[PDB]
Structures are given as C-alpha cells and as structure tokens.
Symmetry: C3
Subunit: 259 residues, 3 copies
Amino acid sequence: EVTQRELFEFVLNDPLLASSLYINIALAGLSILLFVFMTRGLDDPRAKLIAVSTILVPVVSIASYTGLASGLTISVLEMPAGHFAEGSSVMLGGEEVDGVVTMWGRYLTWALSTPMILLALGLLAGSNATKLFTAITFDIAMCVTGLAAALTTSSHLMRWFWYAISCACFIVVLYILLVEWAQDAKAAGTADIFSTLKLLTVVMWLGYPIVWALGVEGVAVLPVGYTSWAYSALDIVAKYIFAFLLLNYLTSNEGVVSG
Amino acid sequence: EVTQRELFEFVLNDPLLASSLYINIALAGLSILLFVFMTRGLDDPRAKLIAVSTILVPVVSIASYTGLASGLTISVLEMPAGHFAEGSSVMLGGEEVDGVVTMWGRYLTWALSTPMILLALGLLAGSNATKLFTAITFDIAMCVTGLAAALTTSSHLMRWFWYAISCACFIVVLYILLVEWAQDAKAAGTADIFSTLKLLTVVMWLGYPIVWALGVEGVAVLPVGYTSWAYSALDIVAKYIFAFLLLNYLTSNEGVVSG
Amino acid sequence: AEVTQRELFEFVLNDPLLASSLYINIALAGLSILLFVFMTRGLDDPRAKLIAVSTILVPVVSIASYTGLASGLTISVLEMPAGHFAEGSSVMLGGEEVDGVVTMWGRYLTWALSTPMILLALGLLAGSNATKLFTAITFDIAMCVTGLAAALTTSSHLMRWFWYAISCACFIVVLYILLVEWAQDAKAAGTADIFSTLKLLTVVMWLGYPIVWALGVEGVAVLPVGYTSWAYSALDIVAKYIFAFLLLNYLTSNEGVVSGS
Ligand SMILES: *C/C=C(C)/C=C/C=C(C)/C=C/C1=C(C)CCCC1(C)C
Ligand SMILES: *C/C=C(C)/C=C/C=C(C)/C=C/C1=C(C)CCCC1(C)C
Ligand SMILES: *C/C=C(C)/C=C/C=C(C)/C=C/C1=C(C)CCCC1(C)C
Ligand SMILES: [Br-]
Ligand SMILES: [Br-]
Ligand SMILES: [Br-]
Ligand SMILES: [Br-]
Ligand SMILES: [Br-]
Ligand SMILES: [Br-]
C-alpha cells in the first residue's frame, strides 16, 4: 500500500498542491492569533460563546490542513468500473501506482468545522434550539455522506448515490439559512451582518459540491492540484474572512448580541 | 487484501443478504418522505425538536444500509482460536479467503441512531437534562463497545468481555426507560403514548444482543443471511414503525408536548 | 496488515511490564465504577446527579480504553520518520522481528472521551456558565485529537512535533480556564476549597502526560514502550480513579451545596 511519507512527498514536489495546503496552515494559524487578539475585550458570555465557536473554525482548519499536508489524511484509491478516472495512476517518486489522490481529510474535518460555522451564525441570528439542532445535525450528515461517497470504490453508482443523500441534507441547511435564520436575524437586531454572512456562506458553500463533481472524485475534469486550490480558496472566504467579518462586527456590537 | 468491490458483489450472489439490505434502504427513504409530510403541520419549536430527532433515525438508517450494501462498512475478519466460527472461509469471487463476513457497519451507525430515538422519547416524557445525558452517554458506550466486540479478533474471551461491558451499559438505558421516564411521562401528560413506545423500544432493542450472540459474531448458529434479516426486521419496528407511531401522536397532540 | 491483532495481544502478554500496566487498570477502573455507583446511591438533586454521572463515566471510558489496548485492538506498529530518535527500532512480534515501534494510540483516542467528562464535572462543581464549559471541552477535545494525530504521523519528524505544539496550545486554554476562570467561579458557587484541591490535582497530573509523551517512544524515546505505558497508567490512577473518588466523596456529603438547578 502507499505510505504516509510518500503522500507527504507527493504533496511537496508538486508546487500547486503544496501551496494550497501549506498556505492555509499559515493563514489559519495567523487567523487564530488575530481572532484571539481581536476579541480579548469581550465580557458578555453569549458574545463570547459566539466568538469561541467562530475561533474554533480556523482551529479545526489548521489541524485539517496539517493532516492533509502530512499525508495522514490522504489516500490513493482506485475508482470503480465506468468512473471517469478509472485506469488513472499517480506515481510516487520513482514508482507508479493505480488510483487517484483522495484527500478525504477535508470531508472528515468539515463535519467538525462547519457545525461551528453554523453554531456562530445561528446564535448571531437569535436562532432557537430546534433550528440550531436541525441545521447542525443535517450539516454533519451532509459531511459524513460526502466522505462516504469519496471512500466508496465498489460502484460508480453508489458514489453518486451517496452524493445525492448529501445534497438532500445540504438543502435542509440551506433552507434554515435562507428562510428561517433570515427572519430571526431581524428580530435579534442583526439582519445587517447576517445578510452579509448568509450570502457569503451560501455562495461559498455551494462551491464545494461543484468542485467535488468536477474533480477526480467526480467527472475528473479538474486535476488534483486545481481542485485542491479551489477548496483552499473557498476555505479562505467561507472560514477566514467569514470569521474576520463576524468577529469584527461582534466586537463593535457586543451589546446587541448580548441579548 | 479483500477489495470493497468484492464485498459489494458478495452481497449479491446471496439473495438473503442482499434483500435485507436494499429493502431497508427503500423503507428508510420512504419512511423519511412520509414523516416529512406528516409533520408539515407542526409549529411548536418543542414539538418540532421531537419530530426532527425522530426523523433523523431513518436518515441515519438509509446511510447505514447504503454503507453496508456498498461494502464500505463491511469486512472479513478471522475469528480467534476457540471461536465457533474460527476456521471459516467466505470466497468472494473464484478464490476463497479465510474469515467471516463482519457487518460492523451496523454497530457503528447505531451510536448515531439510537441516541436520536432516545432523545425523542426523553423529550416526550418531559425528561430533565440529567436523565437525557445519562441515557445517551451510556447508550453510545453500549454501541461502541459492541462495535469493539465485533472487531476484536485477538481473543475469544476478549470479545465476550466487550459484550458484557456493552450489556452493562444497556441496563442503564433500560432502567431510565422502564423506571425513570415512565414516571416523568406522567407529569408531562404523555404516559399513554409513552407506555406504547416504551414497551415497543425495550422489546425490540432487547433482541439485538440475542441476534449478535446467535449469529456468526457469537456462537454462529445462524447464517449471516438470517442474522442480517433479524436486525433488518428489528429496525423496521424499532425505527420506522416506531417513528410513525410517535409522529402520529405528536401531530395530533402538539399542544401536549409544547412548552 | 502483516502485524495481526493476535500478535499484538500476545506481545502485550509475555511482557510483564506492559501487560501489568494494562490489565491492572482494567480491574482498577471496574472496581472504581462499582465503588462510585455504590457511593452515589443516595443522591437526589438532578444537578448533583449530573456531576456524579459525569464523574462515573470517566472510569467507564477507561475500562473500555484499557480493554482496547490489552486486546490489541487499539495498538499498532509504526515506523518512525527519519530524524526520530526511535527510527530503525524493531519490536520482534510473534516469531519475527518487525521494524517500527509499538504505538498505543488507543490511549489518545479515548482521552478525547474521558477528559471532557472530568472537565464537565469540575466545571459544574465550580458553578461555571455554559460559555466556559463549552470552551474548556472543545479545546480539551482538540488537544486529544491533535495528540493522536501526532502519534499517528509517520511521514515527517517535524510534523509530529508540530501536531504536539498545536495540542499544547489547546492545552493552555484548558489550563487557563481551570486556573483562572473556574478558580474564581468556585468562590461564588461556594465550592472554593474542594475545587481548588481538585484543580491543583488535575493540573499537576495533566502536566505529566505531555511530559511522558515527550520522554517516551513517541517522543525522544528515552522511555521504552513498557515504561511509557506504566507512566500513563500511573497518571490515570490519580487523574481519573482517585480524582473521581475524592470528588464523589465531597459531593455525597454536600449534595445541597451543588443542588442548584
Ligand atoms: C470549511 C469548510 C466548508 C464551509 C465546507 C463546506 C462543504 C460543503 C457545503 C460540502 C458539500 C457536499 C455536497 C452537498 C455533496 C457531496 C459532496 C460534498 C461533501 C462536497
Ligand atoms: C436502530 C437500532 C437499534 C434500536 C439498535 C439497538 C442495539 C442494541 C440494543 C445493541 C446491543 C448489544 C449488546 C447489549 C451486547 C453486545 C452486542 C450488541 C452490540 C448487539
Ligand atoms: C484520563 C486521561 C487524562 C487526564 C489525559 C490527559 C492528557 C493530556 C493533558 C495530554 C496532553 C498532550 C499535549 C498537551 C501535547 C501532545 C501530546 C498529549 C496528547 C500527551
Ligand atoms: Br464567559
Ligand atoms: Br476543516
Ligand atoms: Br422551530
Ligand atoms: Br442505524
Ligand atoms: Br435526575
Ligand atoms: Br481513557
């Protein structure tokens, strides 16, 4: 089987791939330090709950990229019969191996970082427990079935079937984000910053299943190095600037979020 | 090294095993649709919290059966010396490999579904946080040790030690169902419906450890084909028919569970 | 998958040190559960009982953890990266010599489950709000998970220590809540004396873990697998079993102080 050090060497040796992971390790790390410094003045527990939940997003992110760049959460899988990338090979150093580079480390950690994005947003919008629970549970289900899709190599049909279940879970999250929380925000007095984050979230999040479908996991029209940067670019907005904006607001409106 | 492709095909060529899986994938999916249209009328956040966790049971189920049917969450493990299934073979294709067919995928997802059934029941009985936390934590411990039980291939005795630990956690759950929530349901005003679901749950759940003990995992007096159906049958009652009854009540008494 | 669970199971056995460090705690943990259940029988206030159940779950996670290690289910033989002081080591498993080191990752995996429980009890005992409980618990979990990643990384020596550093960062957050935040909250909750004792006990023992990790095979390798295992089992006996014994001992004589809601 392929070795962890080999995937690690495969990431290096490939500038596109290496830069998409190592840059976000630095960016997530700097984001954490920046965010902690920005909220060192909060005093209200609810505002502080929102801040910590937000800060956890890049915390999980930095561990995710370290797991990917270290080769710990990457594997070489062979696609099933009729998969647009079946018969492909990867080549580690001087050897060649059948399969595609499957970076499942992303799908796995999303199940931990996205619930946190949703938690901060829901709270910021004055959501009640029932909606938080719904958004979060289905969001986690979306991430897990997506991971399952990437890890399934027995059938091409199964892969897209998992993908469909994940899409169904995704619409549930979309519904509360666009319909439910958009209304709550007004009642909480945060409609302004929410609108911004909601639009940002929805637009960025929609990009993930597109990239998945266009990359080696899907119809393989994009290389692993390209698909990886697309995700990394999405992360920079959906996580880092998204967190900067929320915490920039939060620190200037601690009283309104206090309740 | 057995490939996922082989286990998938192995599920075929064996109508008994295959049917028990694909049939529940459809019953789960259908159940979800029904439940969504049944709870369309609810407007009480507490009533909707109960319905969402109830709906999450079949949602986790479709995913579990898909993982199993696809071969993702199935493995062939050689049982330890002295084990009644030790020395068996499976033969995936034209070749024959030592071991048994372990469907650990079921034990894994229970740690996600069972907690949802319990959340529903606990909320119905007007349980307090302490009793909810107790049932859910010990319930998860029950599932995970069962999974550990099934994956232990080093010692026959260790497998059974796991089994015991799992049974001990099980009694904790049974004790809050039969004794604790039974009393709480009175103050809530749902002793009626609770008594029904409560009696249903306990009897069905009580059957899982028995199937495990009889199947290839335990004494091996039952073929994987029958053992699989036993669980499938049990799920249909412990999950789908159970969810329907709870949701049916809920939709007719939203004012009762409200608050 | 050359190294089978069986070989690992038998490697533990036939190695008195290692075996004893695992089996002794399967017994100590089990006896602890019984003792704690027995001790808490007379509790009635739901909040007091939350603290008790949270505390009791600690030895529950522990008995399962040790079973996973002794059974060989959560142990693996891994080859250390170039530069690691243990690179080029052999374990001699079964009737063959195997490259690598015996990595007991099962300990790290379960800490993510038991430590959050130690923290819930303490936090509750200190009369903590939800924000601090949530912060303490998520960073505690992050600490455990990144510690597990550190021991599971075999590609690069620098990556291993980088995971370790991230994990340490998570650790200071837990240490700051315990030493700064809850220390003050306990004064308001009327549990100052007992929290401070348990605060110190917890802080002192928890510092032992990253030290053992650094000194043992996963780290600079001055401690062979058998001795790093016993060090952790020794730490667990104090940080889990006796820590819980002392907390439950106080709780059962002061149910009213923590009664609240
Ligand atoms: C920090 C990471 C973020 C915000 C990730 C978001 C990911 C998604 C919205 C992923 C969605 C997917 C589907 C809807 C279909 C199946 C595949 C996925 C997992 C890529
Ligand atoms: C939808 C699934 C349900 C309701 C599953 C319930 C499962 C159990 C009550 C399993 C219990 C087990 C034991 C108590 C001992 C060891 C083996 C198990 C995992 C079958
Ligand atoms: C029952 C187990 C307990 C109380 C375990 C405590 C473990 C720690 C405080 C571990 C900390 C670590 C770091 C700060 C750095 C990396 C390695 C670890 C996981 C040993
Ligand atoms: Br606070
Ligand atoms: Br992430
Ligand atoms: Br609602
Ligand atoms: Br399930
Ligand atoms: Br209680
Ligand atoms: Br543990």
